[PDB]
Amino acid sequence: SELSFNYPNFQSVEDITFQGGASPRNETLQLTPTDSNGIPIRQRAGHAVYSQPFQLRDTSFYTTFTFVIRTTSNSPADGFAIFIAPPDFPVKRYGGYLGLFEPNTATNTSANKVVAVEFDTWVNTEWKEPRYRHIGIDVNSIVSVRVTRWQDKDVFSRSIATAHVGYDGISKILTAFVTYPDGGNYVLSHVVDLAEIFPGDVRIGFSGATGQYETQYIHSWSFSSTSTN
Amino acid sequence: SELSFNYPNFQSVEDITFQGGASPRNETLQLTPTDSNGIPIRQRAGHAVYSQPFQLRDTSFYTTFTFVIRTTSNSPADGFAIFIAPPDFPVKRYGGYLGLFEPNTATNTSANKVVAVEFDTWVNTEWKEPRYRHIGIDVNSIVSVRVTRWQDKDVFSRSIATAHVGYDGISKILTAFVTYPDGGNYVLSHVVDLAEIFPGDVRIGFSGATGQYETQYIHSWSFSSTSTN
Ligand SMILES: [Ca+2]
Ligand SMILES: [Ca+2]
Ligand SMILES: [Ca+2]
Ligand SMILES: [Ca+2]
């Protein structure tokens, strides 16, 4: 179906649904909470999602956002993701689950209905992932189906970075382009039939999790979807 | 191979090669020529290319550019493309061939070695293409392998539009995202093994062609390629 929205900043959070530890702060979406000292709170997940659902049958979409990761140590955790899931999707487990999965089923593709592009700051040994920070495409599992190294210079840059996520409903391909100003660029594409995974309604939004020594902020976001009929 | 460059504008053309009707003008790449009164010259083609070759084996890349199409009537022709081809690839035929193909072999995939993202302002009946203006991915033929409607409001906007073109060398997927300020967004993706097509060296650049009542300008361009090992 057709849906579009545009937040040049988050001065207004009209039409955004928060769950968990996410909240509006300083015209951004702050995905995980900070204490009265400004220190990231450990073991917390949060979501900020566009409130109105849309349908993926016979649909392409384009979305872009800008983001900052604020780290306060060399060992930040855990990252964040932009994700698509059904509209009743709750906040799931904190830490390396990224607010998107639960321990007993996080690697079982038959037990989940969620697709994400993840920005992973913390190498987990509880499941298989790369031994370096990474950006990935996740399809119903915390074990990414496509993953690439995310350079530490970019992770720690304090830059306002940009992501572009598109889905071509004819070729059934999800793509992310991530760019840093005077830094790295990252490209990931994967064949997946989103309409088959999601035959009904879905929402799009962000999930962040700690972890420790990290807060994730979304500064701007826009989205459009169009019929491929 | 690894290659990066960045032209925030074309106050510098240091590494750009001009061929055919293309030239540096008004701090842009002007792909097809205009006469002394600024009127687009009919039946011309031009290329503006990054002068250094690179290789595609075990490579991903990301490139972005901004552009303007200046039209002087409601029937502009023919469009432009961003392309990859061998380093000796010349400016080819003007008109609907887009500076990329030869009339005798334009639909013969075995006879060409060129991949492009094309912005097509003129509906040709001489070969198969849509009955409306369109953006397309071309692989060794003027008949696009993946094509989508390009809205006339965007075609005629006079806006500085953006394109993002990436190639994921693991998944072998070429994607284009095209955006207009307060206008349409476009997403096209296609599975194609570029290293198989291009086992040696390539150069990337732009091809424009007239046609009539149209000039194509590239305002900025950046590129990065990285190894997938
Ligand atoms: Ca991961
Ligand atoms: Ca992790
Ligand atoms: Ca065409
Ligand atoms: Ca044409």
The three-state (H, E, C) secondary structure of chain A, written as one string: CCEEEEECCCCCCCCEEEEECCEEECCEEECCCECCCCCECCCEEEEEEECCCEECCCEEEEEEEEEEEEECCCCCEEEEEEEEECCCCCCCCCHHHCCCCCCCCCCCHHHCCCEEEEEECCCCCCCCCCCCCEEEEEECCCCCCEEEECCHHHHCCCCCEEEEEEEECCCCEEEEEEECCCCCEEEEEEECCHHHHCCCEEEEEEEEEEEECEEEEEEEEEEEEEECC
CB–CB contact A171 B164 (8 Å) = no
Question: Distance from the CA of A96 to the center of ligand 2, in angstroms?
Answer: 5
Interface of A with B (CB under 8 A): 60-62, 64, 146, 164, 166-168, 170-171, 173, 175, 177, 179, 184-191, 224, 226
Q: Which residues contact A186 (CB under 8 A, 6 or more apart)?
A: A135, A148, A150, A176, A177, A178, A179, B62
CB–CB contact B168 A187 (8 Å) = yes
DSSP H or E stretch at residue B196: helix B194-197
- Report the distance separating Cα A227 and Cα A54, nearest Å: 12
> In angstroms, what is the resolution?
1.4
Experimental method for this entry?
Answer: X-ray
C-alpha distance from residue A220 to each of A45, A163, A182, B126 (Å)? 20, 10, 20, 45
- Report the distance separating Cα B132 and Cα B147, nearest Å: 11
Q: Which residues contact A58 (CB under 8 A, 6 or more apart)?
A: A169, A195, A227, A228, A229
Chain centroid to CA B203: how far?
A: 12
- Ligand at minimal distance from the CA of B129 is 3
Q: Which residues contact B102 (CB under 8 A, 6 or more apart)?
A: B92, B93, B111
B187 chain-A contacts, CB cut-off 8 A: 60-62, 166-168, 175
Query: Residue B93's closest CA among B71, B110, B112, B74?
Result: B112
CB atoms within 5 A of ion ligand 1 belong to A 120, 129
B5 to chain A: nearest residue by CA? Answer: A182
CB–CB contact B179 A146 (8 Å) = no
DSSP label at B95?
A: G
- Domains with residue ranges and CATH for chain A: 1-229 (2.60.120.200)
- Reported as half-sphere exposure (CB side, CA atoms, 13 A), residue B81 has a value of 33
CA torsion A179-A181-A183-A185 (nearest 10°) is 20
DSSP, collapsed to helix, strand or coil, labels residue B43 as coil
Longest dimension (CA), chain A: 53
Q: Are A197 and A83 in contact (CB under 8 A)?
A: no
In the A/B pair of chains, how many CB contacts fall below 8 A?
Answer: 76
Q: How many residues does chain B have?
A: 229
C-alpha distance from residue A80 to each of A5, A44, A211, B159 (Å)? 21, 12, 11, 34
Q: Are A107 and A141 in contact (CB under 8 A)?
A: yes
- Ligand at minimal distance from the CA of A107 is 1
Phi, psi of A124 (to 5 degrees): -90, 140
Question: Tokens 């399809």 belong to which residue?
Answer: A139
